[PDB]
Structure 1
């Protein structure tokens, strides 16, 4: 039966040329004899170029290849939360099978124009630099771009951990379900990341899709689409999701290898022609649905690893032109004690200020303007600008795995921008900050409480904030 069953004609470096299979569809998942699986990427007149979800050592010329009849699809649903799966949805955490009841294709089309609505509500990162200067909204594709070992994964993990305060509370439309896709990471770093998330009780609402460096190039290619499908499930059902791709550079590398071995014509740096397509059709599925479609959303935080800070390399060019902003991280700012090492002069968020909270809007407008003028200048007037800039840039530093609530951030940046720390010279702010935080956490729960309940600093709470901050400043070392 040479119409639903082919036979391997050649094999090498991951690419199975299969003779037969006259009725297979383009990008259909076929099953080899040895249990492995593949995707029919090339449909040529004489053969089918299949990419193997495994290794070449086990398949061999002459093996049999059956066909399944369906395009590649993954399991989706609630049942994946807390589970670590691979790029196909198979559990790799040893906790048993996934009890998922719904399957969903991986290469679906992004929602159109009518189903969307403008990005209005905030995705709280819990990071002061982000939530203040580069705000992110639910429905936005914010790039996290930077060179190696600059703190990108840490930004993603701080976001995932910060979502816990909303996920434990009562507001069903403020909860966020996180997906973390790991592409080309070490298996060790993914295991330690899963532990980090389990310690902070951040797994009960997180899905971890993992295509590590020891996985076939097709699996690293497919993993972002599997994760995006798992997130589109929540998007289409009135819930809100947040998917991190860590990172897209290695997915592009896997696709480049796959296509180069399928003999497709290479372009710049041997990337195929549609490698832009590859990412755009992936990053366009992150949308904010209007309330006629459920009102859900899917926020994307793709990660990109540049080389020597070159951001107009091919893949960084593509992903910068696709996304709605970026968060630049710098090694030089990393070693100057600025952590998170966010270069604010370059970091962008086009749909940012519309998502920000009213209180944080108030405070971060002034903060951004002051940092802007300080960066523009960096007598007895412009070194006032210098000193304000120093205090503000010392107010942005933050520790790892400890994301702050929004009202605490507004309190800190408010103590900063009103001029209260003009008394304190630079290397002190840090101390004050922590101390100040403790104060406003212990004795002043009502102020933060209704700053969170009202979303803004109305004049009663403004006076309360100023009296609190100067009372604490007077009795501070």
Structure 2
């Protein structure tokens, strides 16, 4: 009665709303209606149970991920076909992609540390295994540089489980695709990744399948192979631009009669797919890139805010215009699950205190940039001038890091302590005295 969308291998032309029978990955059958198609893929909306044309009807099989540990090291299209000049994947298992396969997720909360090597993530809004932590951006800002840098650098310090990356790019140019391929190959980051690249001019249905192939590969490696898998998806806004024109959505208006029910829940079929996996040896973590579209009036898309429930990393033009990379502004950024990923045994015991203190000092110094403008630099107190200066040091030393610079959390906390020495010790009101004596550079060892 208009349920789930599934994705089917196309073997003949089909018409809109054509009734079809589909053999699922688990061997059962479904009846449904065609919504749209590319050369090789059909999007079908399933009926529950029996019926919801009826004699001489198309029978098809679902589109599958060829799942194997040998996905690692390969660069594929959005449909899973090679782009790297290698042979097609030889599967251990053929899995449906819409999220129904495996039932992999545990009812356990996300928890341990993922070291991205980027101080403004690991330091102040830590990524934890099983989390969904979007990077929020806008045209012109280097969100894909950050995504690619995390793909090269990320690890799970101390874990007994192997680590893998799934990197899925949607709607990208040829030059972007060549650049991402080059990057993965030259750095050796490819050996632990599966890369799915969908181009702007590839079929829109292929773009819609892209994150499902990627999430299914991640779930397979996490659950069947006990891995912590980090899924980078770029750009969910480009996905949404294909979705709003696919199938039953075409020239229909959100909020109006004729807009199809599945458009309100499609994005949740992506964001639901993250978490610790059963057995607790592996996990699926997502870092989706959400770029602010500049065209809400002309191209209404489903609301992206459903993707934002466990925090956000905010890319700020102010910092970009100052010449700083990564231009992440930690103050509007948040990781709701950070405390589950930090402290003794995970990062270091002083982690929360240092993050809290850097955060508070930076927010105060940024407000003092306003006060300086209101009263003049020479009217600021000594103490306030220290905080004003601290916000510069924060931006120039802690936020700023090289594209190729992979900071351990120790590196990150040490830079944090060094800049914190600019503040008067009696002004560190978020840091327990135990930690000042043990870790502050004036008391250390």
Q: Secondary structure at the match of 2:338?
A: coil
Contact between 2:223 and 2:282, CA under 8 Å: does it hold in 1?
yes
TM-score, structure 1 length as denominator?
Answer: 0.72
Distance 1:271 1:230, change over 3 A: farther
CA spacing shift, 1:235–1:377, aligned 2, 3 Å:
same
Structure 2 partner of 1:330: 316
Secondary structure in 2 matching 1:84: strand
Aligned ranges for residues 260-279 of structure 1 at < 5 Å? Answer: 260=248, 265-267=252-254, 272-279=260-267
Determine if contact 1:374/1:386 at 8 Å carries over to the other structure.
yes
Match of 1:462 in 2: 439
**Is the Cα–Cα contact under 8 Å of residues 21 and 57 in structure 2 kept in the other structure?**
no
Render the CA deviation track for 1:355-409: whole Å, top value 9, x for unaligned. Answer: 1323433422221121232234433232222122222222221121322122111
Which of 143, 147, 156 is the aligned partner of 2:147? 156
Deviation at residue 331 of structure 1 after TM alignment: 2.0
Deviation readout 1:390-434 (Å, 9 max, x if unpaired)? 222222211213221221112111111133899xxxxxxxxxxxx
Partner of 2:185: 198
Match of 2:239 among 244, 248, 251: 251
Q: What residue number does 1:411 align with?
A: 414
More helix by share: 1
Q: What is the deviation of 1:306?
A: 0.6
Distance 1:410 1:306 in 2: 32
Could you tell me which residue of structure 2 aligns to residue 187 of structure 1? 174
2:206 to 211, 219, 231: 219
RMSD over aligned Cα, in angstroms? 3.9
Contact 2:167 2:195 survives alignment (8 Å)? yes
Residues 274-293 of structure 1: pairs in structure 2 closer than 5 A: 274-289=262-277, 293=279
Quick one: structure 1 residues 252 and 27, their matched pair in 2 at CA, closer, same or farther if it must change by over 3 Å?
farther
- C-alpha distance after superposition, 1:87-115 (max 9, x if no partner): 22221211112122112111124998992
- Between the two proteins, the alignment pairs up a number of residues equal to 397
Q: Identify the match of residue 344 of structure 1 among 321, 327, 330.
A: 330
Per the alignment, residue 438 of structure 1 pairs with none
From 22, 25, 34, give the equivalent of 2:30: 25
Cα contact 2:109–2:275 (8 A) shared by 1: no
Q: 1:214 to 1:113 in 2, by over 3 A?
A: closer
* Structure 2 CA distance for partners of 1:204 and 1:114, relative to 1, 3 Å: closer
> Structure 1 residues 109 and 130 mapped into 2: Cα distance closer, same or farther (>3 Å)?
same
Classify 1:113/1:466 alpha carbon distance in 2 versus 1 (closer, same or farther; 3 Å): farther
Task: Indicate which of 392, 395, 414 corresponds to 2:394.
Answer: 392
Q: Which secondary structure state, in structure 2, belongs to the residue aligned with residue 327 of structure 1?
A: strand
1:209 aligns with 2:168: no
CA distance in 1, matches of 2:94, 2:300: 34
Residue 64 of structure 2 corresponds to residue 73 of structure 1:
yes
Q: Report how far residue 17 of structure 1 moved.
A: 3.3
Distance 1:315 1:104, change over 3 A: same
Residue aligned with 2:231, SS: strand
Does the C-alpha gap of structure 1 residues 317 and 347 become closer, same or farther in structure 2, counting only changes over 3 Å?
Answer: farther
| SS in structure 2 of the partner of residue 211 of structure 1 | strand
Report what 2:375 is aligned to.
none
Gaps of 5+ in 1: 10-15, 49-63, 423-456, 470-477
Confirm or deny: 8 A CA contact 2:167 2:194 kept in the other structure: yes
Cα drift, residue 204 of structure 1: 0.3
Seen in structure 2, the aligned counterparts of structure 1 residues 216 and 6 have a Cα distance that, compared at 3 Å, is closer
Q: Does residue 96 of the first structure (1) align with residue 87 of the second (2)?
A: yes
SS at match of 2:123: helix
Q: How much has 1:215 moved relative to structure 2? A: 0.9
For the residues of structure 2 that align with 1:197 and 1:81, how far apart are their CA atoms? 12
Q: 1:406 to 1:88 in 2, by over 3 A?
A: same
- The whole-number CA distance in structure 2 between the counterparts of 1:126 and 1:316 is 32
Q: Is the CA contact 2:78–2:206 (under 8 Å) kept in the aligned structure 1? A: yes
* Paired residues of 2:235 and 2:289 also in contact (CA < 8 A): yes
Q: Does the Cα contact within 8 Å between 2:249 and 2:263 map onto a contact in 1?
A: no
Does residue 38 (structure 1) correspond to residue 37 (structure 2)? The answer is: no
- How far apart, CA to CA, are the structure 1 residues paired with 2:413 and 2:246? 48
Segment of structure 1 superposing worse, 189-198 or 320-329: 320-329
The answer to whether 1:300 aligns with 2:305 is: no
